Design an enzyme around this catalytic site. Structure first.
Site, PDB file in Angstrom:
ATOM      1  N   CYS A 223      -3.922  -0.506  -0.184  1.00  0.00           N
ATOM      2  CA  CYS A 223      -3.238  -0.108   1.193  1.00  0.00           C
ATOM      3  C   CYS A 223      -3.728   1.304   1.380  1.00  0.00           C
ATOM      4  O   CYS A 223      -4.640   1.823   1.082  1.00  0.00           O
ATOM      5  CB  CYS A 223      -1.722  -0.742   1.307  1.00  0.00           C
ATOM      6  SG  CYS A 223      -0.638  -0.119   0.007  1.00  0.00           S
ATOM      7  N   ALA A 225      -1.299   4.210   0.071  1.00  0.00           N
ATOM      8  CA  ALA A 225      -0.663   4.781  -1.356  1.00  0.00           C
ATOM      9  C   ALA A 225      -0.984   3.825  -2.483  1.00  0.00           C
ATOM     10  O   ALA A 225      -1.225   4.223  -3.451  1.00  0.00           O
ATOM     11  CB  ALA A 225       0.838   5.013  -1.250  1.00  0.00           C
TER      12      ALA A 225
END
Ligand code: NX3
EC number: 3.1.3.48
Length: 285
Positions: A223, A225
């Protein structure tokens, strides 16, 4: 604290939800403490030469599980913020990694080639609520070159809630040799608050997971992080495998486990609750 038969898991969700999700709160706090008496080193992530390679200064890649790039003719050309993570039974079924920065598109595609990854699961938009989440690491159209991997966009299907892009990539320093890489990109994101209805996601998970080919490298999942939505995906995917296999579930145990392989996988209580909603949908459906 071991597997729960699938027939009583749904009942269990009721209990976790009651009294304002008190039970969910206790579970997730256990998860966050589960690392407490545990020191896991991430020296490579903290090395000055690798810093500009991390999207967030606090989101690291544990040494023991980190994906290593083949070193290059510098000392830290082996580093990328990514970790092998286990799937249902099978070890290292996933590479969970951050959304790639411009300065790491080369590492990113080199890893994909070197690990023989054939599937990318992307669980963010580039920009969300005006904020930069991820740099676009693929060609808007035709081809684009990153290091010795040049990626060609072959087709795109855009659905209600996600997009599928089929790429062909070739290594220039090979032979060249080419692979198909398919990207599943979930695109349905809230202007306000967070995702809530889990059914479209269940479908995304089912189709992206079923796309995995024998016998290939680990599925790349990212995604922004590379921990929150990424962990949610891995747990929903793995637990659906377990249900098909043994008709039992073990969310709390599997999550505490993969938490040793990458920091903060499944980052919030809301995501933790969402995993349960997804699996409840699969079970009732
Ligand atoms: N603090 C924080 C950190 C990371 C993310 C967030 S956040 O955006 O506010 N929160 C979330 O992202 C949440 S909260 C409940 C579900 C989800 S994501 C559900 C989802 C969507 C698509 C897929 Cl394919 C999957 Cl597997 C799961 C908040």
């Amino acid at each position: 604290m071991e597997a729960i038969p699938v027939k009583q898991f749904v009942k269990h969700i009721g209990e976790l939800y009651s009294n304002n999700q008190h039970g969910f709160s206790e579970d997730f706090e256990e998860v966050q403490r589960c690392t407490a008496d545990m020191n896991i080193t991430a020296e490579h992530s903290n090395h000055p030469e690798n810093k500009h390679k991390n999207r967030y200064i606090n989101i690291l890649a544990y040494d023991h599980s980190r994906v290593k790039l083949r070193p290059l003719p510098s000392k830290h050309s082996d580093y990328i913020n990514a970790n092998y993570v286990d799937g249902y039974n099978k070890a290292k079924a996933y590479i969970a990694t951050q959304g790639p920065l411009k300065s790491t598109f080369e590492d990113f595609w080199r890893m994909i080639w070197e690990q023989n990854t054939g599937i990318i699961v992307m669980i963010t938009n580039l920009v969300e609520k005006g904020r930069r989440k991820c740099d676009q690491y693929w060609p808007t159209e035709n081809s684009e070159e990153y290091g010795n991997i040049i990626v060609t966009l072959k087709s795109t299907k855009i659905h209600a809630c996600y997009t599928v892009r089929r790429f062909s990539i070739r290594n220039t320093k090979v032979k060249q040799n080419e692979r198909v890489v398919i990207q599943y990109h979930y695109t349905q994101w809230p202007d306000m608050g967070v995702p809530e209805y889990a059914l479209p996601v269940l479908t995304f998970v089912r189709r992206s997971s079923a796309a995995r080919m024998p016998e290939t490298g680990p599925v790349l999942v990212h995604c922004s992080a590379g921990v929150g939505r990424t962990g949610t995906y891995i747990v929903i995917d793995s637990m659906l495998q377990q249900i098909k296999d043994k008709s039992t579930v073990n969310v709390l145990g599997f999550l505490k486990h993969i938490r040793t392989q990458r920091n903060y996988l499944v980052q919030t209580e809301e995501q933790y609750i969402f995993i349960h909603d997804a699996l409840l949908e699969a079970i009732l459906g």
